[PDB]
Design a binder for this molecule. Structure first.
Ligand code: FAD
Ligand code: MCN
Ligand code: FES
Ligand code: FES
Ligand code: MO
Lengths: 293, 160, 770
């Protein structure tokens, strides 16, 4: 229990936040949700001098269908991903994926902006968002960056976010039309940090070849992992238990996971393996529209 | 070095007090707002008992610094009972022996409260289990709780 | 109107306290001028120390004192445990640290230094600043290599533990003349109770020195007896106050180092001291259990009947005895046979030491670990003999006939003798009627492209009298209400309800009007406590002859009040109808009348010299079969427990609604032990499972949609009322039956040894298809 001592402030605006924590501390931290920071405090695994509460800043809370993409504010709650738009193409994968993030009590306060900056190796969001080819706009005192999700994820509990700067919004490209999206994970109890999980997304060619496929892996290394070559197999080829099995069985060969408590290294590689093909199963079906259902 | 003044609504009664930022909401809601009803078991958003209604949404009073709750409505297990009469959730919990120790009772009850008060949905055994799942108990296990919640929702809706 | 209450489903009396939140818990308590104790615990598994630097801890403001070892090895005895001793030999030690010794460290999480500050936030703020340099010693972890003993824990050495031995008649000939002789060793997982309320203590001294108040939760709250002796200030003056408890499962049962440090520090400062445990701490400091090694052997004939059965057991006690005396180890060695025909036996239990958290007594201690191996050797035996586990257990269960069956095993001291006084009856019709209730055969019949089924039996050492006595008291009043004092303790299993019924039945007063007071040693100078499914026939047996002492004290006193002699109508309202049907005197007005008129209107007859209540030599042994079916996902490691049904015979269920809680709830704690819970230590010595993210507690979705309950009240034992202990009968055979099902569903060999059953182990079916 018992978190360390710190000074605490609530930011009024997006640059107010940047303005204050900048001169406020070499080691000043942001809070928003809390569900990762506050527990890291009761374990005394973090020593912020200054905490900046941004959880009460206007703009970063809404969901837009801008252009050929979809904008999501950083302070968007996990619960407001299971609900409600939800978003376009909706269910996308996320409402199927967020439904795994712990429980309602935690989902009620955990932000998307937090989980990405926190970047737990087993975080369900980045794994998904990499398969969607995310794009993260990060405002700083000096200027504003936009970083794709591939460079963002550094290691477990490490992101490529510069100290001081702030994740503002995540925008995902609205992919093609009538494609298949699925997400499954395995864990001892429903909602625990999964042993292995996968998010696979297939786009149909109708005439029914495969036009595009994006695959990611939960718990293959220190971060989410694109199986860029396991995807190459599916391309042009149709359906089929085998192409699926051949794709899945070839996504895990490049993976060395970490153990031990919940499972060993090679173990996880085989769980992830059944996660890939299984997601690819429902990654069809959902890809059927033409609607009339 | 730094004091913070809270203006929070708790179970109706509004409070104004200065607290050091690092004190967790759970500790604040037990001292000196002596509402021991909220209970603390794990220390990292798991045990359940921890759970309170924040602004209508059930959140853990234990992953929230008391300071983060300024200018907000908060409700605890003390707020169910209205003039002697136990809130129906409390009644069915006793009618179905949904509790033996006591700890996992604030947690579950407060989780179930806004779900109850809002007109939907029914709660059937399967959907009932999923609802309470965010709370752990080491005594029941759940069978009677799941049976308790369902009972509460029948006298609620279809109700003779 | 002869309204009956025992056996009825009545809603609990405790309910409202806990629902509204009017009830106070140990952590809930606040006292002005409080000091907050935080404990600096070990970070080494095995190490001797030079510790002298609390300087910057002492010098941070808000901190009143930092307690080192030198303060407390004083007086400052070392944690005594009591009777059950012989002793053989000897004791010291463990006891634990027992209080912070300035020399060696025997496990991570051991108390070394206590701080005392104004708020608990500042308390551990100063706890960090304490520095202790260690000499790392070699680390002992495997119970078997404990006694093949290099790397000795105590320099006095101080042979690791106590060696318990029990063995009937002629097992040499029972084995030598056997066709199938079966040898296999089993290993049980190290897990505990892990209740929701962590441990918490509050001590307020009356600096008038006369006394000391402890709203601490010390689990026989009548074991001030230890603290008294330790502090040498006995015996009243250590007045214990009642608090509600958030579950214990025996894991909290007794005196801890924290208890005495607080009490000492409180006394010698005249300042109230408060202590509240981390969960993390709880995982490394609160008593452990369950870790054993079960070498076993069987002697069988072409019929399949038992002739001989047993070999050595290695109970890993952690680093220390912690009023966790051979008691449980002694029990274990007594009943690895369960309710079976077992002509002979050879227990050689080795209670041993390792660098782990000192082992206490988890719900059904030593009987979860034993009924596992026993039912895992019986299932294995059916593989070679060739035929069904169902019809093996079916005809060499417990002949009766035989009854009373004075065994059959030892040399019978469970825990003293002599027993097993199995005067309680029909072993079989339970199993028979339990499967005639009603499925089992119905989904052994499985199209089973899913998975399969399992069984297991459990008898229980569950009224550990204790022996001789238990106190109780009933009091009628001027206000309508009734009061019951008892040596019981509401861990949250419904004592205060059960006793109220017992009293209600005999007094003809609604259980609503009756209140129950417990664990308040000023009202109750003597009580035994609550462990080993006991408190009903003992403390309920106290309540009976208390309520039966008033009826004479009253009915006699009522005949004097009016002028009618002691015969009337039949006499209950609760009041007094003579005749049919003139007049009446209520039971309360009688009491209100006995004021300062030369007297007193109450009873408290248990007990005197030659005790009361009287429960002596032989306890009741309840028995029960668990039935399970599981499905398994083989491409991953998953499983969904499709069905579950524990069924246990126990005469006179006092409250059916609440007993259902005690059966189901326990059963789940068993599944938790069977498939989720294990304390994992890293090979160097550090605990890995310290949070809740690591240690897996069963949650709502994974549990069986129903545990069915089959209890019958045939054959009431002869301790009036003929009732049994039931607070443990859930978990007993929960481990073995799950295990059998898993092996039945794969299906290879029936060859599972180590619990729990991890998802990694459970793709050895990827092998099967390969
Ligand atoms: C798979 C998965 C499992 C989970 N399991 C659990 C669980 O078992 N128990 C539980 O309690 N929670 C769980 N969570 C919740 C998890 O802690 C999330 O990270 C949650 O969103 C935490 O709140 P937060 O990150 O929004 O705010 P915080 O936790 O306060 O954020 C922590 C860190 O993120 C940084 N940060 C936050 N927002 C921004 C921003 N806009 N720009 C820059 N930096 C920022 C801060 O600097 C801070 O140091 C889980 C989440 C996932 C994805
Ligand atoms: N409503 C009840 C309650 C109990 N009994 C039975 O009658 C006796 C009265 O209970 P008690 O003597 O307290 O049994 P124990 O002392 O062994 O403690 C109860 C048992 O079961 C428990 N149930 C618990 N339930 C809760 N909620 N919290 C705990 O900490 C509990 N701890 C325990 C522990 S420890 C055990 S071993 C027990 O034999 C019990 O089996 C009964 O018939 N009907
Ligand atoms: S202790 Fe705060 S949520 Fe369990
Ligand atoms: S938590 Fe102990 S009774 Fe439910
Ligand atoms: Mo117990």
């Amino acid at each position: 229990m018992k978190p360390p001592s710190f000074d605490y402030v609530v930011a009024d605006s997006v640059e107010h936040a940047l303005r204050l924590l900048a001169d406020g501390g070499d080691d000043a931290k942001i809070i928003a949700g809390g569900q990762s920071l506050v527990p890291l405090l009761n374990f005394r695994m973090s020593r912020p001098s200054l905490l900046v509460d941004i959880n009460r800043v206007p703009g970063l809370a809404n969901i837009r269908k801008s252009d050929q993409t979809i904008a999501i504010g950083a302070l968007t709650r996990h619960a407001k991903l299971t609900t409600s738009k939800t978003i376009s193409q909706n269910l996308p994968i996320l409402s199927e994926a967020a439904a795994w993030i712990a429980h309602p009590q935690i989902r009620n306060r955990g932000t998307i902006g937090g989980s990405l900056a926190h970047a737990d190796a087993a975080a369900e969001l980045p794994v998904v968002l990499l398969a969607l080819d995310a794009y993260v706009t990060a405002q700083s005192l000096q200027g504003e960056r936009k970083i794709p999700l591939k460079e963002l994820l550094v290691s477990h509990f490490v992101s490529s976010i510069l100290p001081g700067e702030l994740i503002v919004e995540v925008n995902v490209p609205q992919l093609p039309h009538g494609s298949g999206a699925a997400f499954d994970e395995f864990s001892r109890r429903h909602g625990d940090y999964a042993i292995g999980g996968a998010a696979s997304l297939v786009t149909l060619d109708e005439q029914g070849k495969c036009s595009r496929a994006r695959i990611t892996v939960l718990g293959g290394g220190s971060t989410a992992i694109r199986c860029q070559e396991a995807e190459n197999i599916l391309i042009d080829s149709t359906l089929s238990s085998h192409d699926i099995a051949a794709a899945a069985h070839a996504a895990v060969q490049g993976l060395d996971p970490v153990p031990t408590v919940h499972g060993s290294a090679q173990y996880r590689a085989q769980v992830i393996r059944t996660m890939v093909e299984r997601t690819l199963a429902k990654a069809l079906h959902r890809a059927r529209p033409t609607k009339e259902s | 070095m730094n004091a913070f003044r809270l203006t929070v609504e708790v179970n109706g009664v509004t409070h104004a007090t200065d607290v050091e930022p690092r004190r967790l909401l759970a500790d604040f809601l037990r001292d000196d707002l002596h509402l021991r009803g909220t209970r603390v078991g794990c220390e990292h958003g798991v045990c359940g008992s921890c759970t309170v209604i924040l602004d209508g949404q059930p959140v853990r009073s234990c992953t929230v610094l008391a300071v983060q709750a300024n200018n907000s409505r908060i409700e605890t297990v003390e707020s169910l009972q209205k003039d002697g009469q136990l809130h129906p959730l409390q009644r069915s919990f006793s009618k179905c022996h949904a509790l033996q120790c006591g700890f996992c009772t604030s947690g579950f009850l407060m989780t179930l409260k806004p779900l109850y008060d809002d007109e939907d949905v029914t709660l059937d055994a399967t959907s009932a289990r999923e609802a309470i799942s965010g709370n752990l108990c080491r005594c029941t296990g759940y069978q009677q709780i799941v049976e308790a919640t369902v009972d509460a929702f029948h006298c609620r809706d279809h109700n003779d | 109107n002869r309204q009956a209450w025992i056996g009825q489903e009545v809603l609990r009396r405790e309910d409202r306290r806990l629902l509204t939140g009017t009830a106070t818990f140990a952590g809930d308590l606040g006292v002005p001028g409080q000091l907050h104790m935080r404990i600096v615990r070990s970070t080494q598994a095995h190490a001797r120390i030079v510790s002298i630097d609390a300087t910057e801890a002492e010098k941070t403001p808000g901190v009143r004192m930092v307690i080192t070892s030198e303060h407390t090895r004083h007086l400052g005895s070392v944690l005594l445990e009591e009777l059950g001793y012989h002793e053989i030999y000897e004791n010291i030690e463990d006891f634990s640290h027992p209080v912070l010794a300035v020399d060696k460290v025997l496990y991570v999480g051991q108390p070394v230094v206590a701080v005392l500050a104004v708020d608990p936030y500042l308390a551990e703020d100063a706890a960090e600043l304490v520095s202790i340099e260690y000499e790392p010693l070699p680390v002992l972890l495997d119970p078997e290599e404990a006694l093949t003993g290099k790397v000795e824990l105590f320099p006095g050495r101080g042979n690791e533990g106590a060696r318990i031995k029990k063995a009937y008649g002629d097992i040499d000939r029972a084995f030598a003349e056997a066709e199938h002789v079966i040898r296999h060793k089993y290993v049980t997982n190290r897990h505990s109770g892990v209740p929701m309320e962590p441990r918490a203590v509050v001590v307020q001294p009356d600096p008038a020195r006369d006394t000391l108040f402890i709203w601490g939760t010390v689990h026989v709250h009548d074991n001030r007896r230890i603290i008294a002796k330790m502090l040498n200030l006995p015996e009243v003056n250590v007045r214990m106050k009642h608090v509600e408890i958030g579950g214990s499962f025996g894991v909290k049962g007794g005196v801890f180092p924290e208890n005495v440090v607080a009490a000492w520090a409180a006394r010698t400062l005249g300042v109230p001291i408060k202590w509240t445990e981390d969960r993390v701490e709880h995982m490394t400091s609160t008593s452990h259990a369950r870790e054993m090694v079960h070498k076993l052997e069987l002697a069988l004939d072409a019929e399949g009947r038992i002739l001989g059965m047993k070999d050595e057991i290695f109970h890993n006690h952690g680093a220390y005895f912690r009023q966790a005396e051979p008691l449980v180890s002694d029990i274990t060695a007594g009943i690895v046979f369960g309710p079976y025909r077992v002509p002979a036996y050879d227990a050689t239990l080795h209670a041993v030491f390792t660098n782990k958290t000192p082992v206490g007594a988890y719900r059904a201690p030593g009987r979860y670990e034993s009924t596992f191996a026993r039912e895992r050797i019986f299932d294995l035996a059916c593989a070679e003999i060739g035929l069904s586990k169902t019809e093996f257990r079916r005809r060499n269960l417990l002949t009766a006939e035989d009854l009373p069956w004075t065994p059959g095993l030892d040399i019978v001291h469970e825990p003293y003798h002599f027993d097993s006084g199995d005067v309680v009856k029909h072993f079989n019709e339970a199993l028979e009627a339990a499967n005639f209730s009603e499925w089992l055969e119905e989904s052994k019949r499985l199209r089973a492209d899913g998975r399969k089924v399992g069984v297991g039996l459990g008898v229980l050492m569950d009224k550990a009298g204790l022996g001789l006595f238990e106190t109780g008291g009933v009091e009628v009043s001027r206000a309508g209400r009734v009061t019951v004092k008892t040596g019981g303790s509401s861990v949250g299993q419904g004592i205060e309800t059960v006793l109220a019924q017992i009293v209600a039945e005999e007094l003809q007063i609604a259980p609503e009007n009756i209140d129950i007071v417990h664990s308040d040693t000023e009202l109750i100078p003597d009580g035994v406590g609550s462990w080993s499914s006991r408190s009903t026939v003992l403390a309920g047996g106290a309540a009976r002859k208390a309520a039966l002492a008033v009826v004479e004290k009253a009915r006699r006193l009522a005949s004097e009040m009016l002028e009618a002699d002691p015969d009337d109508l039949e006499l209950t309202a609760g009041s007094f109808k003579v005749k049919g049907t003139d007049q009446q005197i209520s039971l309360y007005e009688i009491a209100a009348a006995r004021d300062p008129f030369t007297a007193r209107a109450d009873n408290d007859e248990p007990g005197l010299a030659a005790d009361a209540v009287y429960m002596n030599n032989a306890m009741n042994y309840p028995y029960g079969v668990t039935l399970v079916q599981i499905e398994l996902d083989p491409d991953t490691g998953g499983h969904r427990i499709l069905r579950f049904s524990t069924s246990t015979e126990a005469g006179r269920v006092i409250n059916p609604l609440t007993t259902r809680g005690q059966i189901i709830g326990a059963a789940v704690q068993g599944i938790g032990g069977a498939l989720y819970e294990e304390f994992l230590y890293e090979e160097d010595g550090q605990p890995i499972t310290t949070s809740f993210m690591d240690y897996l507690l069963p949650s709502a979705q994974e549990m069986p949609n129903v545990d069915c309950f089959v209890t019958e009240d045939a054959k009431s034992p002869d301790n009036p009322f003929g009732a049994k202990g039931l607070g443990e009968i859930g978990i007993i055979a929960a481990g073995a039956a799950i295990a059998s099902a898993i092996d039945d569903a794969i299906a290879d060999g029936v060859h599972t040894d180590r619990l729990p059953v991890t998802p990694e182990q459970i793709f050895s079916r990827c092998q099967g298809l390969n």
